[PDB]
Amino acid sequence: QGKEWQENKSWNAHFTEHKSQGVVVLWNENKQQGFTNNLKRANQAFLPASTFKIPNSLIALDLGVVKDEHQVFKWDGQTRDIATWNRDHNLITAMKYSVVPVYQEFARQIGEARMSKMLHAFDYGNEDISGNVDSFWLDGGIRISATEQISFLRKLYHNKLHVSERSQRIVKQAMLTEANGDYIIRAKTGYSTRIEPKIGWWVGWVELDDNVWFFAMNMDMPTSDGLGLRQAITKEVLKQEKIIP
């Protein structure tokens, strides 16, 4: 009651079960109240990695670098380690498969000056694009906490970012991850591997009939083996909190 952030260390049981470490942050939009298993880690800023595809998508769409969610981004012919990257993509499949090369091309066309202005307008993380214009979210200066992800996501949900309503609608479509008669999840995965420590991200929100629960989680990810725990652990927390059955 009235508390801004409440710590619930019982969620650590979900991390410990999988011999892992991290944070889940929830925000109840109706009550304007946050919950986390770790207040400190909740506010620790990391590389966004592929969670950066949300603001990158928005900026690309607003500037006309991406025409719409149907525009085809031709594979450059370089065979990369992730099979799904080695084919043509539109914004939907690029987001779904986390296709870095497509987004690196977006970033180059956006350019450092306009990328910087946009991240300042978005109040995104530390607003620092230092490093390579086409890799800064992977190994440059930009850093964002789970609680800063939620602030940015809430603005996207309410179409309050200083880009077009259309841009915001298309990205929220592109974020669609799961839906049934109980809930809808719009979300984006990330895996930061270029700079220690290696972490997994899942950020987004749960739409219910009468409420929205924003979430941002990150966890230590020494190998790709555990990538599935990003979603599995978040769902164990959403279930415990009765947000999803």
Site residues for a copy of itself per CB under 8 A: 92-93, 96, 165-166, 169-170, 173, 176-181, 184, 207, 209-210
Q: Given the rule CB under 5 A, which of 19-27, 34-42, 72-80, 92-100 is the region that contacts Br ion?
A: 92-100
Question: E strand or H helix at 25, and its extent?
Answer: strand 22-28
Nearer to a copy of itself, 30 or 173 (CB): 173
Residues in the chain: 245
Q: How far is the CB of 72 from a copy of itself (least distance, A)?
A: 11
Nearer to a copy of itself, 63 or 176 (CB): 176
CA 126, 127, 132, 136 dihedral sign is positive
Options 50, 98, 145, 167, the catalytic residue: 50
- Partner that binds at residue 96, options Br ion, a copy of itself, none, CB closer than 5 to 8 Å by kind: a copy of itself
Annotated active-site residue 50? The verdict is yes
Q: How far is the CB of 217 from a copy of itself (least distance, A)?
A: 18
d(CA 196, CA 222): 9
- What the block records as the tokens of 158 is 């309410």
- Partner that binds at residue 98, options a copy of itself, Br ion, none, CB closer than 5 to 8 Å by kind: Br ion
Nearer to a copy of itself, 96 or 114 (CB): 96
Q: Which of residues 165-194 bind Br ion (CB under 5 A)?
A: 166, 169, 173, 176, 189, 191
Q: How far is the CB of 240 from a copy of itself (least distance, A)?
A: 22
**Phi, psi (5° rounding) for residue 176?**
-55, 130
d(CA 191, CA 95): 13
- Amino acid at residue number 85: W
Using DSSP's 3-state secondary structure scheme, residue 210 falls into coil
CB atoms within 10 A of CB 174: 23
Nearest-CA neighbor of 223 among 189, 188, 193, 190? 193
Residues lying near Br ion in the complex (CB under 5 A): 50, 98, 166, 169, 173, 176, 189, 191
Please list the active-site residues: 50
